[PDB]
Every structure is written in structure tokens, then in C-alpha cells.
């Protein structure tokens, strides 16, 4: 006999990026609340910024900017080490893309609160980050 069971991601299960930045499932938060960008879209996973000082995780930054640039233009971007020298760094070439695409060079964009309704002064950084379940 071979049973089947359903398992869905409940509060307390794990996730993980592709750079060891292992997270966890904190709590669920109705979509009527989350911010909304300028163009009406609604983040589906929120990420604490306190990590990356004392993580040296720069993969997440560079490759999230990458995910956005890709899904915009239409093509898939390579990610092999040792290609981008100190001469033509990753960030600079790789934000030139968002520039000629139409978003802010440093991969940030404004955002509105979801309980007040008021704009927020300090801009926000959004991207598209691959996510393995555990």
C-alpha cells in the first residue's frame, strides 16, 4: 500500500535562498495590508534588512536586481563566477539594464503603506529571488 499525504507550508516551516540565508515562516498577513508599489503590485514575501551587515551576502542583492532585469527584458542572465572583473563590475553593468529599461538605477522604487495610505519617504528595494522550500 502507498498512501499520499498533503503538506502545505504552515507557520513555522522553513525556506532558503541560494546563499545560505535560511529564513523561517513567521506569520501570514492579509493582502489588503501589504504595501503596493507605484504600479499596483503587492510583495508576497517580506525580508528583514538587518541581515546583510554581518552576512556578507551580496549574492542576494546582485542576483535580485538580476531577477528583475531579466523578467523585464525577456532573456535569462548568466551567473558564472570569475567573469566580471574589477574593471567592469557586476552592479554597474547590471544596473545599466534597469536604467535603459525605465526603473531606478539602484534597483529601488517608491512604495506606499497599506494601513495609513500615505506615501513613504525612504524608497524601497524590490527584486525576484529564487526560493527553495526545505
Amino acid at each position: 500500500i502507498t498512501m499520499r499525504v498533503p503538506r502545505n507550508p504552515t507557520i513555522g516551516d522553513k525556506f532558503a535562498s541560494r546563499h545560505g540565508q535560511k529564513g523561517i515562516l513567521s506569520r501570514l498577513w492579509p493582502a489588503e495590508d501589504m504595501p503596493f508599489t507605484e504600479s499596483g503590485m503587492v510583495p508576497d514575501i517580506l525580508f528583514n534588512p538587518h541581515g546583510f551587515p554581518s552576512r556578507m551576502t551580496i549574492g542576494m542583492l546582485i542576483e535580485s536586481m538580476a531577477g528583475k532585469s531579466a523578467a523585464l527584458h525577456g532573456l535569462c542572465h548568466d551567473a558564472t563566477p570569475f567573469i566580471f572583473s574589477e574593471e567592469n563590475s557586476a552592479l554597474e553593468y547590471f544596473g545599466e539594464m534597469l536604467k535603459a529599461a525605465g526603473y531606478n538605477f539602484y534597483g529601488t522604487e517608491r512604495l506606499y503603506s497599506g494601513i495609513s495610505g500615505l506615501e513613504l519617504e525612504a524608497d524601497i528595494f524590490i527584486g525576484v529571488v529564487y526560493y527553495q522550500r526545505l
Binding site: 548568466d78 574593471e87 567592469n88 539594464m97 536604467k99 535603459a100 529599461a101
Partner: peptide, 15 residues
């Protein structure tokens, strides 16, 4: 005499 290789780095810059 020695043999060279091409150099890849600078890729397509934005459309």
C-alpha cells in the same frame, strides 16, 4: 610560440 584565447567579459549592454 605561445597561443592566445579570446576574452569574453563585456556582454550585451542594454537594448
Amino acid at each position: 610560440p605561445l597561443q592566445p584565447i579570446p576574452a569574453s567579459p563585456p556582454p550585451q549592454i542594454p537594448p
